[PDB]
Design a protein around this nucleic acid. Structure first.
Lengths: 35, 177, 128, 133, 128
RNA sequence: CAAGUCUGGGCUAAGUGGUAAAGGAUGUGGCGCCGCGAAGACAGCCAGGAGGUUGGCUUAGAAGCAGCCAUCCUUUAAAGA
């Protein structure tokens, strides 16, 4: 999403690592956090 | 407690684990010692407010401890302290503080609260005789109301090294009154 | 005449001995001055009661399901155990699950009774 | 299988009792009038009920010592609430009368012990602006 | 769905429901964080157990006296309830008093058993 | 393209090295704190997912799960402002 400033939402939105990449995964489309 | 060393060697002690403080007691002063570690633990408990001491060579395991320092520098990490003792029946320079509890008057009803320029008290009750915790709070809090020195209400050891009418604590509008 | 022994006694003391001795000895040190001995004694009683369950010297009337009479049957379950309206209905629905014991800790006679009450009301029941 | 709060002597206020229970599984006029049958013993002071309808689109069931706070109110003598509690805190009330009121509500009220009961009183009272004073 | 109600439920919950739910809910707030709810629940269980007693859906095997076999019978009572040597003998002697329930809180079968054990051992027993 | 692919003890796994700031993020590697595992501890799992709480403005609906004010009591396994 914003590419820069990813910071958790649903009370369980996950900080995961893919390609030295910080993307956040949750169970709501409403989270798709991607830097 | 413990705290040691006392030759003449700053720069390095001022490096590692032993910050330097002066051995100070009316009449005599010997080269600093002690060590940032101990400091930590106890100044931690309560520099210039509680009061213990060290056992260097058993020496003169007496009290007072600090009457001057500054956790100095930039980092907010102290170095170079001032220790003083009083085996005397003269202790006058007495700085310990006093507290309240939150007497619901301005707060728990009007939101209103207080300014405590005070907190701490420097006086001189009974030497080597001061509550490690002095409590004093005739409650009362709201409107453009304020209280200080004078009124104060002091217990036993009758000193008051300070002065009347000044910086105790008052109630002020947290938003309004 | 020793600690571990006292433990042994509280332990063996059937759920009844536990509950009642708890009452008593507390009655010796009140629901305040007291705490340690009879208070844990309670959990003990829990364990013993269970024991009764696993064994057979105490039964569990479980609801297997409701049919064509959920209203009346829920009335029965409610009056029977002393479960608020809402609570009672929730459980009643649960009736089918293993813990579906509409009334646990009932003698042979009383349990047969309970089973009979639900059954009549409009539900199918089963004992232990 | 529904909970509701309602007005003694009354029973079928279109807006608050028609929608809800009616839809959840209730015959609003029936339940309402039986209701009247009931509240007729304590009319004027609001009362609460847990009404269960099971599998015929029917029933009713229980009235249980109305919300402390508001009942207290009724006792005190004041419609709505100041505006905000501990911030508009000014509805001072009394011990005795309090504790008695307790004694009466004891039912749907915590166990059946003075201490706990009256205590619940101060609590609610507070919540509203009713200050045990 | 209300306090007094919960009280009602704990109350009705037969001694077993009390003991076991005490165990459980404690298991929800531990024999420390917990206290209020299942700890009094215990006294409740005491009351209910008693209830069982007064009614008949639970029995009390009482010792009426010992004859020509106090040794062996005391052996029986001791093993049976789990009472230390001394304690066991004292009670055995008491056997004659109303509280002389050698084993209280025993089903029909188990109680008949107990009565039989003491009897055989060398004592006269009676059930409730 | 002249001279240790020296040896010694760490840390890097991004070619950073071969330019960048605020700001991110149980990355990694080293140092201090609060709570316990036999009140046998966090994630697993069983379970009740307590009651006066459904209190005021706005209600037309706060009755945590509109928002502005509370944040008590509790019978009892606790409590969940």
């Amino acid at each position: 999403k914003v590419r820069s400033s990813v910071k958790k939402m649903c009370d369980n939105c996950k900080v995961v690592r893919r390609h030295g990449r910080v993307l956040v995964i949750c169970s709501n489309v409403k989270h798709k956090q991607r830097q | 407690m413990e705290l040691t060393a006392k030759p003449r060697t700053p720069k390095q002690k001022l490096d590692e684990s032993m910050i330097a403080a002066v051995a100070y007691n009316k009449e005599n002063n010997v080269s600093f010692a002690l060590d940032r570690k101990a400091f930590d633990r106890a100044f931690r408990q309560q520099s210039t407010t509680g009061l213990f001491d060290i056992t260097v060579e058993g020496g003169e395991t007496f009290p007072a401890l600090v009457k001057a320092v500054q956790m100095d520098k930039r980092k907010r990490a102290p170095i170079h302290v001032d220790f003083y003792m009083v085996t005397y029946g003269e202790p006058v320079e007495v700085s310990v503080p006093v507290h309240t509890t939150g007497r619901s008057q301005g707060e728990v009803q009007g939101g209103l609260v207080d300014i405590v320029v005070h907190n701490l008290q420097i006086v001189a009750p009974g030497p080597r005789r001061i509550p490690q915790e002095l409590v004093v709070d005739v409650t009362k809090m709201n409107i453009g109301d304020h209280i200080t020195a004078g009124d104060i209400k002091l217990p036993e050891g009758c000193t008051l090294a300070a002065d009347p009418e000044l910086t105790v604590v008052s109630v002020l509008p947290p938003r309004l009154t | 005449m020793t600690i571990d022994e006292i433990i042994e006694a509280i332990e063996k003391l059937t759920v009844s001995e536990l509950a009642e001795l708890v009452k008593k000895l507390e009655d010796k040190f009140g629901v305040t001055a007291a705490a340690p001995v009879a208070v844990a004694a309670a959990p003990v009683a829990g364990a013993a009661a269970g024991a009764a369950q696993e064994e057979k010297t105490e039964f569990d009337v479980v609801l297997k399901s409701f049919g064509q009479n959920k209203i009346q049957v829920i009335k029965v379950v409610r009056e029977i155990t002393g479960l608020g309206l809402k609570e009672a209905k929730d459980l009643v629905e649960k009736a089918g699950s293993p813990d579906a014991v509409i009334k646990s800790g009932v003698s042979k006679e009383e349990a047969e009774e309970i089973k009979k009450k639900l059954e009549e009301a409009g539900a199918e029941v089963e004992l232990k | 299988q529904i909970k509701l709060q309602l007005p003694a002597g009354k029973a079928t206020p279109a807006p608050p009792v028609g929608p809800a229970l009616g839809q959840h599984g209730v015959n609003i006029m029936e339940f309402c009038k039986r209701f009247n049958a009931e509240t007729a013993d304590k009319a004027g002071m609001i009362l609460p009920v847990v009404i269960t309808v099971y599998e015929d689109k029917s029933f009713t069931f229980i009235i249980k010592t109305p919300p402390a706070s508001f009942l207290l109110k009724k006792a005190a003598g004041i419609e709505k609430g100041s505006s905000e509690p501990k911030r508009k805190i000014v509805g001072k009330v009394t011990r005795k009368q309090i504790e008695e009121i307790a004694k009466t509500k004891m039912p749907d009220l915590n166990a059946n012990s003075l201490e706990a009961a009256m205590k619940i009183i101060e609590g609610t009272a507070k919540s509203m602006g009713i200050e045990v004073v």
